[PDB]
Amino acid sequence: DTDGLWAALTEAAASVEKLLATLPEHGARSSAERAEIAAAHDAARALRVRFLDTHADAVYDRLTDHRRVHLRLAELVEAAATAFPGLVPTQQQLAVERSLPQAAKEGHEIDQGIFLRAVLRSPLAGPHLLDAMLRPTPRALELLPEFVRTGEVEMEAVHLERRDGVARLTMCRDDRLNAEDGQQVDDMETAVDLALLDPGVRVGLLRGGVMSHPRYRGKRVFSAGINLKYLSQGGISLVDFLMRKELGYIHKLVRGVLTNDDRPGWWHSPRIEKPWVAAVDGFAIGGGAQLLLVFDRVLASSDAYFSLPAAKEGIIPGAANLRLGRFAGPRVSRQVILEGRRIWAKEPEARLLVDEVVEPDELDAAIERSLTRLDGDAVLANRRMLNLADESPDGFRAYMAEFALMQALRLYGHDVI
């Protein structure tokens, strides 16, 4: 405020704004012209950081009336844009940036990355932005009643269905082997909030439905990595997908959903959590296998394999760098994440991501029989105490914070494209 790191930032954003508005369109730019606009961004982002290292809590307090209003990622970054022009892109710029190919973008998301990273490092705004992400979403809340009634939802990506106290999720995307994308992520969280707020559900289950692509026709398929074509084409939102899906549904599978002080016992269980059982058919690549690292029980086919392909030229493989080590040790996890190793279902070390491996013939009966072993009450009071020791609140947030800005930098890194 007084140390005027803001005017420096403000001052800097202009030199950027001017250079863009007066220099030729990206690829039209000369070696020198490239070195100059690039020099301006760096001085700007460099400033975006210094300002937040000392004023994040303030900035956060103004956007949320002093940690008094829970705001989801999208909301928070938007609110940030209009209340602090220059700090983070506006809806417009994100709109424009999208219009082009990854590599003529000025990489504005990096700012959202610097923003999200500052907030999460803060022991005040950190846990607060995280609680806002655990709250149930408006869409899910909207559908909570008709779900309680019909016992079936059917979104473009997933297909929820209650059945014996089981919130059966099914990522049916036969068109794409279930490649994650912007929408897929929305339905996922909606599908998970539904399974968590529906008293009728006791144990949740994620599984990939049968495919429809000629190469896979007839076979179920868990997951086949993040929708590439958008990474090329600019559909992967640092916030509406990469961060959302971590701070959102994937984190609800661990801690559940944060409700309001309604029902009784909220004083000791403000969050409703339930056990999950993922089942892998065919394979689990990329983001997919990222999910297995947070389930209560992993069932795998005999012919299934797991991998985090984003090795040589890619983006971070999600909070996998935060969880893989815990299941396979530092030499496992790097072989898989750095070197690109691929674990097969029937090999020894597969027992360190998967709980059971059975021939497709009988995987179906096996999934069932396990859906009936986590019914218990201790299986909630054991689950919750295990996850606390497994991954600390601080621990997770620390990771996320640095991920936001490290990954933002990967979307735009030249290699990635």
Ligand X SMILES: CC(C)(COP(=O)(O)OP(=O)(O)OC[C@H]1O[C@@H](n2cnc3c(N)ncnc32)[C@H](O)[C@@H]1OP(=O)(O)O)[C@@H](O)C(=O)NCCC(=O)NCCNC(=O)Cc1cc(O)cc(O)c1
| List of residues contacting ligand X (CB under 6 A) | 176-177, 179-180, 213, 215-216, 224-229, 242, 245, 285-287, 309-310, 314-318
Residue 44 or 153: which CB sits closer to a second copy?
Answer: 44
Minimum gap (Å) between residue 150 Cβ and ligand X? 29
Overall residue count recorded for the chain in this entry: 417
84, 305, 306, 412: residue in contact with a second copy (rule CB under 8 A): 305
Rounded-to-integer distance, Cα 257 and Cα 274, Å: 10
Q: State which amino acid sits at residue 342.
A: R
Q: Which is nearer to ligand X, 47 or 224 (CB)?
A: 224
User: What is the 3-class SS of 257-287, one letter each residue?
Assistant: EECCCCCCCCCCCCEECCCEEEEECCEEECH
Q: x-or-dash pattern for a second copy, window 247-276, by CB under 8 A?
A: -----------------xxxxx------x-
Q: Are strands 276-280 and 203-208 parallel, antiparallel or unpaired?
A: parallel
Contacts of 208 (CB under 8 A, 6+ apart): 170, 171, 172, 178, 220, 221, 222, 223, 280, 281, 282
107 vs 140, which CB is nearer to a second copy?
Answer: 107
Is residue 216 a contact residue for a second copy (CB under 8 A)? no
Residue 208 DSSP code? E
Task: Output 200 or 360, the one with its CB closest to a second copy.
Answer: 360
Is 176 annotated to bind ligand? no
Q: Which does 311 bind (CB under 5 to 8 A by kind): ligand X, a second copy, none?
A: a second copy
- Identify what 327 binds: ligand X, a second copy, none; CB under 5 to 8 Å per kind: a second copy
The entry of a second copy, ligand X, none that residue 199 binds, CB within 5 to 8 Å by partner kind:
none
**How many chain residues touch a second copy (CB under 8 A)?**
88
In the list 21, 28, 32, 389, the residue contacting a second copy (rule: CB under 8 A) is: 389
- How far is the C-alpha of 246 from the C-alpha of 318, rounded, in Å? 8
The listed partner (a second copy, ligand X, none) that binds 390, CB under 5 to 8 Å by sort, is a second copy
What residue 234 binds from ligand X, a second copy, none (CB within 5 to 8 A, per partner kind)?
Answer: none
Question: Distance (Å, rounded) from C-alpha 84 to C-alpha 86?
Answer: 6
CB 332 within 8 A of CB 324: yes
Q: What is the 3-state secondary structure (H, E, C) of 59-96?
A: HHHHHCCCCCCCCCHHHHHHHHHHHCCCCCCCHHHHHH
> Is 27 one of the annotated binding-site residues?
no
Nearest to 256 by CA among 240, 236, 276: 276
Transcribe 275-318 into DSSP letters: -EEEEESSEEETHHHHHHTT-SEEEEESS-EEE----SS----T
In this chain, which of 346, 362, 364, 417 binds a second copy, going by CB under 8 A?
346
- Shortest spacing between CB 202 and ligand X, in angstroms: 23
CA atoms in the 13 A half-sphere facing the CB of 228: 12
Tell whether residue 52 is a contact of a second copy (CB under 8 A). no
Contacting a second copy within 360-379 (CB under 8 A): 370, 373-379
Identify residues 59-98 at the interface with a second copy (CB under 8 A): none
Is residue 214 annotated as involved in ligand binding? yes
Q: Name the strand (E) or helix (H) holding 157.
A: none
Q: Would you list which residues are annotated within the binding site for substrate?
A: 174, 180, 213-216, 224-229, 287, 316-318, 407
